[PDB]
Amino acid sequence: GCAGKACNLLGLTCDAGCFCRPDGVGIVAGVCV
């Protein structure tokens, strides 16, 4: 539950432990879990 706003699977920008998850299949944009 470290969804600050959004997270692109082109790096990292989520709290330690919360992996950056993409929206779905074939999508680079997503949000921190």
JSON list of C-alpha atoms in Angstrom, two decimals:
[
{"chain": "A", "resi": 1, "resn": "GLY", "atom": "CA", "xyz": [0.00, 0.00, 0.00]},
{"chain": "A", "resi": 2, "resn": "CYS", "atom": "CA", "xyz": [2.73, 2.41, -1.00]},
{"chain": "A", "resi": 3, "resn": "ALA", "atom": "CA", "xyz": [0.85, 3.81, -3.96]},
{"chain": "A", "resi": 4, "resn": "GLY", "atom": "CA", "xyz": [2.07, 7.39, -3.94]},
{"chain": "A", "resi": 5, "resn": "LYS", "atom": "CA", "xyz": [0.30, 8.16, -7.21]},
{"chain": "A", "resi": 6, "resn": "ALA", "atom": "CA", "xyz": [1.82, 6.15, -10.06]},
{"chain": "A", "resi": 7, "resn": "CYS", "atom": "CA", "xyz": [4.97, 4.26, -11.00]},
{"chain": "A", "resi": 8, "resn": "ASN", "atom": "CA", "xyz": [6.47, 3.38, -14.37]},
{"chain": "A", "resi": 9, "resn": "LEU", "atom": "CA", "xyz": [8.30, 0.07, -14.73]},
{"chain": "A", "resi": 10, "resn": "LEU", "atom": "CA", "xyz": [11.30, 1.99, -16.10]},
{"chain": "A", "resi": 11, "resn": "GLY", "atom": "CA", "xyz": [13.07, 2.35, -12.79]},
{"chain": "A", "resi": 12, "resn": "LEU", "atom": "CA", "xyz": [11.95, 2.72, -9.19]},
{"chain": "A", "resi": 13, "resn": "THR", "atom": "CA", "xyz": [10.03, 5.25, -7.11]},
{"chain": "A", "resi": 14, "resn": "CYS", "atom": "CA", "xyz": [8.29, 3.27, -4.38]},
{"chain": "A", "resi": 15, "resn": "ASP", "atom": "CA", "xyz": [8.90, 2.71, -0.67]},
{"chain": "A", "resi": 16, "resn": "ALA", "atom": "CA", "xyz": [11.33, -0.07, 0.27]},
{"chain": "A", "resi": 17, "resn": "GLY", "atom": "CA", "xyz": [9.54, -3.39, -0.01]},
{"chain": "A", "resi": 18, "resn": "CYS", "atom": "CA", "xyz": [6.79, -2.13, -2.29]},
{"chain": "A", "resi": 19, "resn": "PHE", "atom": "CA", "xyz": [7.70, -3.26, -5.80]},
{"chain": "A", "resi": 20, "resn": "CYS", "atom": "CA", "xyz": [6.65, -1.15, -8.77]},
{"chain": "A", "resi": 21, "resn": "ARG", "atom": "CA", "xyz": [3.77, -2.94, -10.46]},
{"chain": "A", "resi": 22, "resn": "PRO", "atom": "CA", "xyz": [2.70, -2.24, -14.06]},
{"chain": "A", "resi": 23, "resn": "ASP", "atom": "CA", "xyz": [-0.96, -1.66, -14.92]},
{"chain": "A", "resi": 24, "resn": "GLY", "atom": "CA", "xyz": [-1.32, -4.92, -16.80]},
{"chain": "A", "resi": 25, "resn": "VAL", "atom": "CA", "xyz": [-0.02, -6.91, -19.74]},
{"chain": "A", "resi": 26, "resn": "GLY", "atom": "CA", "xyz": [2.12, -5.03, -22.23]},
{"chain": "A", "resi": 27, "resn": "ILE", "atom": "CA", "xyz": [2.01, -1.86, -20.16]},
{"chain": "A", "resi": 28, "resn": "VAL", "atom": "CA", "xyz": [5.00, 0.02, -18.78]},
{"chain": "A", "resi": 29, "resn": "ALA", "atom": "CA", "xyz": [3.00, 2.45, -16.66]},
{"chain": "A", "resi": 30, "resn": "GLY", "atom": "CA", "xyz": [1.61, 1.29, -13.34]},
{"chain": "A", "resi": 31, "resn": "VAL", "atom": "CA", "xyz": [1.51, 2.01, -9.62]},
{"chain": "A", "resi": 32, "resn": "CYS", "atom": "CA", "xyz": [3.41, 1.02, -6.46]},
{"chain": "A", "resi": 33, "resn": "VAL", "atom": "CA", "xyz": [1.82, -1.88, -4.59]}
]
